[PDB]
Write a protein that binds this ligand. Structure first.
Ligand SMILES: CO[C@@H]1[C@H](O)[C@@H](COP(=O)(O)O)O[C@H]1n1cnc2c(=O)[nH]c(N)nc21
Ligand SMILES: CO[C@@H]1[C@H](O)[C@@H](COP(=O)(O)O)O[C@H]1n1cnc2c(=O)[nH]c(N)nc21
Ligand SMILES: [Zn+2]
Ligand SMILES: [Zn+2]
Lengths: 157, 157
């Protein structure tokens, strides 16, 4: 079931970048094989620098379920969550995080080297207990190629 | 000018708790001695675990200035920003952060031990360039007293 929801996140990223909502990032929040929220980066549409794919998905899932905690749901991120999105994932009480592409795949096309210490385990004050899975195989390949595909769809300006 | 805007952030914290919007946290975003945003925690009001005081202040400052970067403004936080809010402050490019109370003052009344390595200078992956000032003297007294005065007035989240 992981592959289906991670691919849906990659499809959210492509749709969002295509319609100009924001960067090529998508996220899907799943409650026990049922999709609760499916969104992409909305920074340019919302004029909100905090409207990343993960944060947007969390806001919409929490509105739909009338709760501020998602301890029964899991989040699928087309790309490794930034420090802000990882913090938001912690606060949301989400029980599991699956992500497809390493932050370096996004850095390769000009994004900030803005990596979450708590996700990679390099923190002194911030420790994460959350279950984290880096996608492998085909899911990782699909997520990983998103950034070169969108840089070359937009290369000729 | 720091004490005046920090005091306004503390006032926002008290407002939000009194009207039930959220926890005792407030934030003020200032552009060149003029207030662009003044907000408090809206987690309970919005059913949104990302609606901290800093995040809310940022979205509203970006709506008022209709831009997704705040490199000319500064933020005053009644309490030390968590990893999510500090990440949002990084992404917003805010140039200065003044905060009143250490996170431990909020932890003492039941909040998560949720501390931002990049703020305290222990981050490896997350590099912060903005100037950060922890308030002392009366600013610290006011910000710390927020938590003993609001004890058992609000719902913990
Ligand atoms: C600014 O740095 C972010 C991060 O360091 C990097 C990783 O992807 O892309 C940036 N980024 C911008 N928007 C998003 C988003 O919506 N989701 C994710 N995972 N990264 C984003
Ligand atoms: C999650 O824990 C937060 C953090 O660890 C701590 C530091 O302040 O207060 C908690 N907190 C919750 N909401 C807020 C908010 O809106 N502003 C601030 N500064 N802290 C919050
Ligand atoms: Zn992010
Ligand atoms: Zn916060």
């Amino acid at each position: 079931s992981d592959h289906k929801f991670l691919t849906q996140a990659v499809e959210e990223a492509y749709k969002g970048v295509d319609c100009g909502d924001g960067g090529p990032f998508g996220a899907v929040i799943v409650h026990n094989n049922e999709v609760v929220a499916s969104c992409h980066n909305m920074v340019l549409k919302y004029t909100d620098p905090t409207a990343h794919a993960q944060v947007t998905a969390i806001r919409e899932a929490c509105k739909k379920l009338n709760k501020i905690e998602l301890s029964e749901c899991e989040i699928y991120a087309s790309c490794e969550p930034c420090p802000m999105c990882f913090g938001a994932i912690h606060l949301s009480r989400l029980k599991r995080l699956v992500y497809g592409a390493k932050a370096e795949a996004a850095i390769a096309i000009g994004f900030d080297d803005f990596i979450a210490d708590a996700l990679r385990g390099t923190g002194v004050y911030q420790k994460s207990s959350l279950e984290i899975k880096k996608a492998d195989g085909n899911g990782a390949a699909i997520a990983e190629q998103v950034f070169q595909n969108t840089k070359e769809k937009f290369r000729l300006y």
